[PDB]
Amino acid sequence: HSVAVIGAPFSQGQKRKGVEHGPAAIREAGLMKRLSSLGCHLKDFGDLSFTPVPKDDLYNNLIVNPRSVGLANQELAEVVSRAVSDGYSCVTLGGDHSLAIGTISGHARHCPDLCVVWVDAHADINTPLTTSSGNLHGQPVSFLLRELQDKVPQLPGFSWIKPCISSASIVYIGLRDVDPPEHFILKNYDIQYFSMRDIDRLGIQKVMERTFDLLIGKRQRPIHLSFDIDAFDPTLAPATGTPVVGGLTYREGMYIAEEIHNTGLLSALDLVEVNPQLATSEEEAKTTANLAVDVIASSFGQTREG
Amino acid sequence: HSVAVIGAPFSQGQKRKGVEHGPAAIREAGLMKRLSSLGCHLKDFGDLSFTPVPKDDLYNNLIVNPRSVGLANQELAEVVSRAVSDGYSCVTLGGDHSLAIGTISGHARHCPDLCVVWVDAHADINTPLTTSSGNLHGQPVSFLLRELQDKVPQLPGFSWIKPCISSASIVYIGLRDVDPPEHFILKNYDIQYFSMRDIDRLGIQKVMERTFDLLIGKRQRPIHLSFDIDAFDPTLAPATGTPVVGGLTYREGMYIAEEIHNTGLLSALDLVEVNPQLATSEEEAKTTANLAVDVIASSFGQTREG
Amino acid sequence: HSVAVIGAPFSQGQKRKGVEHGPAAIREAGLMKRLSSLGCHLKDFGDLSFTPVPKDDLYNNLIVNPRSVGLANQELAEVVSRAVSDGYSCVTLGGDHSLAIGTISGHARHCPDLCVVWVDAHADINTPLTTSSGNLHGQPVSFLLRELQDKVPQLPGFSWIKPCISSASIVYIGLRDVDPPEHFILKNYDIQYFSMRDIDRLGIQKVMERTFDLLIGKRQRPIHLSFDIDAFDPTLAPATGTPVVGGLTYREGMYIAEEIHNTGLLSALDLVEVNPQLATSEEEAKTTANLAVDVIASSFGQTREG
Ligand SMILES: N[C@@](CCCO)(CCCC[B-](O)(O)O)C(=O)O
Ligand SMILES: N[C@@](CCCO)(CCCC[B-](O)(O)O)C(=O)O
Ligand SMILES: N[C@@](CCCO)(CCCC[B-](O)(O)O)C(=O)O
Ligand SMILES: [Mn+2]
Ligand SMILES: [Mn+2]
Ligand SMILES: [Mn+2]
Numbered sequence: 001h002s003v004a005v006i007g008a009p010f011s012q013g014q015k016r017k018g019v020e021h022g023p024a025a026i027r028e029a030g031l032m033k034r035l036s037s038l039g040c041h042l043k044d045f046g047d048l049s050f051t052p053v054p055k056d057d058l059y060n061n062l063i064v065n066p067r068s069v070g071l072a073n074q075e076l077a078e079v080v081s082r083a084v085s086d087g088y089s090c091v092t093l094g095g096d097h098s099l100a101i102g103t104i105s106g107h108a109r110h111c112p113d114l115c116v117v118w119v120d121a122h123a124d125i126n127t128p129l130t131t132s133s134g135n136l137h138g139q140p141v142s143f144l145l146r147e148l149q150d151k152v153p154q155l156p157g158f159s160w161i162k163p164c165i166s167s168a169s170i171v172y173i174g175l176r177d178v179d180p181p182e183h184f185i186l187k188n189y190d191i192q193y194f195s196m197r198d199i200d201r202l203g204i205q206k207v208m209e210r211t212f213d214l215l216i217g218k219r220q221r222p223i224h225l226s227f228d229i230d231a232f233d234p235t236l237a238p239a240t241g242t243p244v245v246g247g248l249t250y251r252e253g254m255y256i257a258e259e260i261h262n263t264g265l266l267s268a269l270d271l272v273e274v275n276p277q278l279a280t281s282e283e284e285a286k287t288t289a290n291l292a293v294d295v296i297a298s299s300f301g302q303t304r305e306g
Numbered sequence: 307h308s309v310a311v312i313g314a315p316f317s318q319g320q321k322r323k324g325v326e327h328g329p330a331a332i333r334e335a336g337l338m339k340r341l342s343s344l345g346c347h348l349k350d351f352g353d354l355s356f357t358p359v360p361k362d363d364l365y366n367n368l369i370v371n372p373r374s375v376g377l378a379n380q381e382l383a384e385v386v387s388r389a390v391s392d393g394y395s396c397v398t399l400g401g402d403h404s405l406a407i408g409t410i411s412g413h414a415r416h417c418p419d420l421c422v423v424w425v426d427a428h429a430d431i432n433t434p435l436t437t438s439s440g441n442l443h444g445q446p447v448s449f450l451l452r453e454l455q456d457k458v459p460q461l462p463g464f465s466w467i468k469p470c471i472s473s474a475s476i477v478y479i480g481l482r483d484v485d486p487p488e489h490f491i492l493k494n495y496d497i498q499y500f501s502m503r504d505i506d507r508l509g510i511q512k513v514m515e516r517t518f519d520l521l522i523g524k525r526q527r528p529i530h531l532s533f534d535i536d537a538f539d540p541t542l543a544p545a546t547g548t549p550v551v552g553g554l555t556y557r558e559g560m561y562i563a564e565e566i567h568n569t570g571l572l573s574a575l576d577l578v579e580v581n582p583q584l585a586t587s588e589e590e591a592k593t594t595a596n597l598a599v600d601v602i603a604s605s606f607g608q609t610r611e612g
Numbered sequence: 613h614s615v616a617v618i619g620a621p622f623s624q625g626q627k628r629k630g631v632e633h634g635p636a637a638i639r640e641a642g643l644m645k646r647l648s649s650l651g652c653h654l655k656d657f658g659d660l661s662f663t664p665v666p667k668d669d670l671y672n673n674l675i676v677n678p679r680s681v682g683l684a685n686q687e688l689a690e691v692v693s694r695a696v697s698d699g700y701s702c703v704t705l706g707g708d709h710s711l712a713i714g715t716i717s718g719h720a721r722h723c724p725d726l727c728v729v730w731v732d733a734h735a736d737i738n739t740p741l742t743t744s745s746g747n748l749h750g751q752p753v754s755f756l757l758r759e760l761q762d763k764v765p766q767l768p769g770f771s772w773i774k775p776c777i778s779s780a781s782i783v784y785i786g787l788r789d790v791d792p793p794e795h796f797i798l799k800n801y802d803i804q805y806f807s808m809r810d811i812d813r814l815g816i817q818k819v820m821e822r823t824f825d826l827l828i829g830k831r832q833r834p835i836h837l838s839f840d841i842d843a844f845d846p847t848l849a850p851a852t853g854t855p856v857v858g859g860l861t862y863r864e865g866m867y868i869a870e871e872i873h874n875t876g877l878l879s880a881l882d883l884v885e886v887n888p889q890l891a892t893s894e895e896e897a898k899t900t901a902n903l904a905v906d907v908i909a910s911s912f913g914q915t916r917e918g
């Protein structure tokens with residue numbers, strides 16, 4: 001049972017400074033010791049240094065840093081693919097959520113039947129034609145879903161990406177801030193999700209049951225858990241760039257991670273969008289980083305009953 | 307789909323200064339743009355100025371400002387009745403909860419088969435003979451309930467009031483601070499309520515399902531939503547006159563409002579008891595006012611899934 | 613209906629100063645008036661002064677203040693036994709949880725068929741051979757449990773203790789910080805528990821139903837409620853020695869207590885581990901003390917509906 005930890009200090013998928021310090025904050029909160037204590041054999045890749053791209057001008061006068069996000073993701077994908085091939089479950093510390101483009105591509109490279117659990121306040125499924133921000137961290141799923149590719153134009157630095165999962169192969173949990181074109185996309189391609197409303201109705205236990213039934217009800221598949229810290233209520237995870245009131249409780253987040261662990265299928269985990277600079281106090285930054293560690297640890301077997 | 311907004315800056319239903327600034331606070335939290343964005347056609351009646359009453363002495367050496375509360379409500383009912391008759395769903399911003407005497411009377415004047423969902427930590431059903439405070443914001447339901455007529459003395463300024471709701475036409479949600487004579491009244495007239503305890507047991511989905519079965523299970527009826535901000539836990543809505551621990555969560559509040567919207571029958575809404583002056587900080591005032599806007603917006607169609 | 617209140621200002625079951633002030637803090641939060649208001653006839657035993665033991669050296673170079681904890685508990689057990697004998701439901705205010713040794717022994721003397729509901733973030737069932745702290749407040753169940761007596765060494769000051777609880781006769785609620793030897797003990801003796809995880813799944817209503825089915829499903833038994841304030845989430849009860857995130861909500865705590873009261877079988881209650889000195893502010897101290905009073909009051913009939 002081996003875990004690779006990769007620091008992906010990326011900020012260019014969005015516009016708020018400081019999310020590149022997320023991996024450091026998470027390590028400082030004791031991630032490595034927590035993983036070791038659960039019996040994980042660890043390989044720390046440290047924090048990647050991504051190759052910059054000169055003159056990375058706006059795409060279509062809207063999409064920011066496309067070539068940089070493309071190249072960093074290509075490089076990240078290579079590291080992830082390599083680590084999976086060497087038998088590691090891959091933990092990637094962000095950094096903004098655009099790096100899921102790289103971790104999922106790399107993961108899918110030799111685990112092409114992987115499935116995705118995307119825990120997030122947001123659907124992150126705008127395309128370059130629907131985004132109203134230009135921020136790639138709100139578009140990553142659009143580049144990964146095969147059903148969407150007729151609707152996704154080719155960005156500079158993105159040509160290496162081949163859409164690698166189907167719309168039946170991703171489930172969202174925690175949605176509460178969805179743009180209308182994203183809502184259209186989720187309905188049009190019948191992508192399954194559990195918004196905070198569904199959690200309010202069903203409860204987190206049934207949500208996880210139905211999630212796994214949809215994804216691995218008929219066959220075992222390596223699971224890719226892409227966890228945006230903003231899934232949690234901002235009272236619990238204030239240090240993040242797009243906080244939305246009414247999020248997961250601490251207990252709900254742990255229960256999700258616990259059930260992920262319980263499948264035995266976790267193969268890769270992203271923990272993204274922790275931005276210590278956006279905390280109004282050091283206490284706020286640390287509680288956010290500590291929560292991130294709790295999620296990762298619970299995902300690899302830490303329980304609440306000993 | 308048209309919405310009238312009436313500010314009712316009234317404070318004389320109770321003794322704490324500042325609740326008359328509720329409407330301004332709610333407006334400053336961006337109410338009108340939020341309703342507009344939902345597609346609501348808006349008529350703003352502004353904030354009403356109520357006629358003062360000279361020498362408005364205590365009634366029975368106990369009940370405070372009876373004629374002022376009576377007259378202000380008569381005037382409010384007139385504005386409400388007129389807006390409902392012209393085809394608007396009527397949003398009244400308070401102000402203390404005694405103004406529900408006027409909004410429900412005025413609403414019933416045009417829609418006599420209305421039913422009432424009363425979301426509150428309190429039952430607000432004391433009569434002039436049971437009140438231990440003398441505050442009319444804690445008695446408004448007693449003046450409206452037909453079955454209580456013979457137990458409710460005639461107050462100066464109140465003669466215009468015709469009880470318009472039967473005891474089977476109101477359901478309470480969120481109760482946790484109920485005076486013993488209020489409890490007797492609720493039981494003796496078989497008035498249905500879901501206390502915080504019931505919500506703990508059933509969950510808010512079943513609570514809303516049962517609420518609608520009781521009210522509109524036999525026929526469609528216009529719905530009057532009377533929402534006291536103190537229904538929410540004090541941590542979420544600190545700026546209010548009688549906070550009680552152990553209240554609705556943010557998610558529960560939104561769920562109630564969403565289900566109200568989903569009936570298609572919402573005809574009037576009160577958002578009462580926001581008192582910015584009781585905030586310990588400007589942050590606390592704004593979070594309470596923002597919460598008020600979320601309740602109203604959700605009640606008119608804002609969703610958590612886009 | 614008679615209730616005896618016993619202050620047990622003991623701190624030597626652990627190493628953090630201040631928990632000996634728990635009883636005064638709880639009294640200051642208005643305990644006696646709250647109990648009177650519910651119709652409780654009260655006998656106040658005041659705060660006991662426990663006989664000190666000179667030269668109370670570590671047992672086995674690890675276990676702290678054993679003779680002092682042994683003797684204080686013997687004296688406590690005598691007071692509890694006497695009060696229960698005289699027809700009182702016994703409320704014991706702590707003080708650290710090592711005093712449950714005393715209250716449960718005293719209680720069991722006249723009510724040998726008693727059962728125990730242990731509400732706590734922790735299992736408190738380490739033995740002198742498994743404790744890693746040496747603190748007796750984390751071992752009291754091991755001395756009470758019949759099935760364990762062959763694995764529990766004889767401590768100085770502890771010879772008066774006769775195990776009086778069988779493993780089928782105690783149920784835990786709220787567990788989330790369990791040491792591995794404790795987990796082993798719970799599984800090996802088939803001791804039933806509902807962790808925070810079980811509550812997330814079942815909901816607190818089902819948890820209480822099953823608790824009582826296990827304890828009193830076949831016959832009526834006097835109930836001993838041992839409530840560690842740290843069962844509650846640290847945001848609600850910060851003034852305590854071993855806080856653990858992800859605890860009971862206020863509503864869940866009240867619901868447990870309400871259900872205890874509804875059995876009609878509550879015979880004794882411990883409210884332990886309030887340490888006002890661990891509060892970072894007087895507000896935090898008072899809110900913890902107030903929460904303790906809420907629990908005790910609800911356990912004796914305080915309702916949320918009047
Ligand atoms: N949907 C957003 C906001 C658009 C304006 O409403 C937010 C995307 C958030 C990215 B995340 O990784 O945090 O979920 C976007 O930038 O696309
Ligand atoms: N029930 C109260 C308190 C009486 C003392 O227990 C409070 C009523 C609150 C009015 B609201 O509009 O806020 O719910 C009253 O004044 O009647
Ligand atoms: N289990 C602890 C911690 C051991 C180190 O992990 C804590 C016991 C808490 C005592 B309580 O009365 O608060 O539940 C112990 O001292 O045995
Ligand atoms: Mn997000
Ligand atoms: Mn995201
Ligand atoms: Mn109220």
Ligand SMILES: [Mn+2]
Pocket residue numbers: 403426428430443534579
């Ligand atoms: Mn009210």
Ligand SMILES: [Mn+2]
Pocket residue numbers: 709732734736749840
């Ligand atoms: Mn304990």
Ligand SMILES: [Mn+2]
Pocket residue numbers: 732733734840842843854
């Ligand atoms: Mn404990």
